[PDB]
Amino acid sequence: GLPRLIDAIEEASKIPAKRRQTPIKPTIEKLTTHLYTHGASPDSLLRLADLLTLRNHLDQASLAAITRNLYPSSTVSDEVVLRFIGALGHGQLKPTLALQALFLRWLVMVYHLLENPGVLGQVYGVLFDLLDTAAIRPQLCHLLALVTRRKHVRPFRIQAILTLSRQTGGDPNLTGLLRVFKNYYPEIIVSAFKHPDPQWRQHLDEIQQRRSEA
Amino acid sequence: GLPRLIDAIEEASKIPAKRRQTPIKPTIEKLTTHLYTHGASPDSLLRLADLLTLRNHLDQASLAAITRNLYPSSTVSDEVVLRFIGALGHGQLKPTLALQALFLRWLVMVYHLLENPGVLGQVYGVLFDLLDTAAIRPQLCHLLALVTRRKHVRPFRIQAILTLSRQTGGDPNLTGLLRVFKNYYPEIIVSAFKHPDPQWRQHLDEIQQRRSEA
Amino acid sequence: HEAEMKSNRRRWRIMKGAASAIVAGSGIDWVRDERLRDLVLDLP
Amino acid sequence: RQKDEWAKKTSSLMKQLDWFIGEHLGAMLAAEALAASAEMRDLIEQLMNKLVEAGGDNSATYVEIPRESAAARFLVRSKVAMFHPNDARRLRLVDFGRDLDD
């Protein structure tokens, strides 16, 4: 039932809203409802990420609705993760900063479901160089705090984060990340990030429990 | 503080119980309480798996109590999985079938936490060859149901499952595994596996939720 | 004796750091081209 | 030793970067393309060659740059290079290679 809905959203995604022979809001709500009930397979996730990440004619409300109901069934692939990472920052190919904050929030909430959590370590510099962008900084810091390992705490990133902390007048999300840095190198001069939506976490857990059934 | 508890339990596990100078059970109860509260990191899991699978002088009640409290924090490594796999079946060094049944129950309950779930596919024969052992058959069937892929459904395995199903009379755990074999192939003669302990599952989930915080 | 090893190994660290930030800074979709993705991704 | 693999990886990577600069970046810098690619690669080569030449002396790692060089602007905006605070005609790389436990 779900791949038929994505096939429709994909087609409507290709043509402007007023040229659509049907309003899409009814079909976006069917997809939203199916995702809330069943989750999104690995393959459906990948198609949804393309729809959320490439420039198309979908409206912001519909994209945010999809993002907020993107509960994975089973795992989360590198293909999906990297697409959201490549969406981040400024550029004519990239989505709005508001959706970017939602994608970053999402990655924190599904971090435990990545097939290859190390892939975020391989793009650590892409995430880190974006800390200047205030509109996504809180979500960036939380994700970076989960991704940071000792190999990433390099002197130039220590200095960059200290300068950014001083120039913003002390962002508490920046000092939370610096705390993680200090755990690897206590030599450094001195919010413990909580889950951003407990009810979403609880709903994901319910969906995920079906993986034990057979 | 969990390293020191395991150190002491390892030491006492090599001393026959009548020759100990102090009971080990109060320390096992401290271990069990710590596991319930914080879970077991990957490195602690390996040490506990060694305690549970190598021949020692710990009593069956103490081994079961650790197994029932073996909540992983984060992931389950291949080496941990393979320690348990290598303990299954009949052999001078292997644990009791009753403990083996709890090991297989555990593998089912932590299947979604394996770093590399494919590892169980590489030892498929080991699992499937144990099906005639009634004392672990219900737990084997559930794990087999989760792990079997199309490559594993060879003609000789279909026949052995039907031979075993005939020879036991009705066995709904065999019927359930044959149902799984019948998605991959259409052609041969025609109990959904629920999670064995929802309370354990719920408690594991709450411990796992800490991975989203930094 | 061994200062040569990490000198070569460091020389890769500088190229990978600069190559990754250059491709990720260009604005190009580096995710959906294998060549560009290899340029950006650090080693495991 | 494992040393020529860190040399094989770096000669391979250096060719991939030069391909990217020629095929994609130089065109973007125009908005001729060939001229932009040659000056961005010269500048990156000069930048990297020096960073190591200092080793410890962080102060010596600045190259002279033309007043309005778009290459430097792009490298500074991409966070791969930094101007000198006192004057913006010298320019250093960010020192990705330096590590505390290298």
Author numbering:
A (entry chain B), B (entry chain A): 8 to 197, 206 to 229
C (entry chain D): 184 to 227
D (entry chain C): 161 to 191, 258 to 328
Question: Can you list sentences taken from the study reporting this PDB entry?
Answer:
As the core subunits of the CCAN, CENP-H, CENP-I and CENP-K (also known as Mcm16/Ctf3/Mcm22 in Saccharomyces cerevisiae and Fta3/Mis6/Sim4 in Schizosaccharomyces pombe) assemble into a ternary complex and are essential for the integrity of the kinetochore. At the inner layer, a number of centromere proteins form a network termed CCAN (the constitutive centromere-associated network) that binds to the centromere throughout the cell cycle. We here determined the crystal structures of CENP-I N-terminus alone from Chaetomium thermophilum and its complex with CENP-H/K from Thielavia terrestris, and verified the identified interactions. CENP-I integrates into the CENP-H/K complex by binding to the C-terminus of CENP-H, leading to formation of the ternary complex in which CENP-H is sandwiched between CENP-K and CENP-I. Our sequence comparisons and mutational analyses showed that this architecture of the CENP–H/I/K complex is conserved in human.
The homodimer of ctCENP-INT might be a crystal packing artifact, since the complex shows a 1:1:1 stoichiometry in solution. Although the full-length thCENP-H/K proteins were used in crystallization, only the C-terminal portions of thCENP-H (184–228aa, thCENP-HCT) and thCENP-K (161–328aa, thCENP-KCT) are found in the structure. Overall, the ternary complex adopts a sandwich-like structure. ctCENP-INT and thCENP-KCT on each side pack against thCENP-HCT in the middle. thCENP-HCT contains two α-helixes HH1 and HH2 to interact with both thCENP-KCT and ctCENP-INT. In the structure of thCENP-KCT, three helixes KH1, KH2 and KH3 wrap around the HH1 helix of thCENP-HCT. On the other side of the complex, helixes α5 and α7 of ctCENP-INT contact with HH2 helix of thCENP-HCT. L224 in thCENP-H interacts with the hydrophobic concavity formed by L89, V126 and V130 in ctCENP-INT.
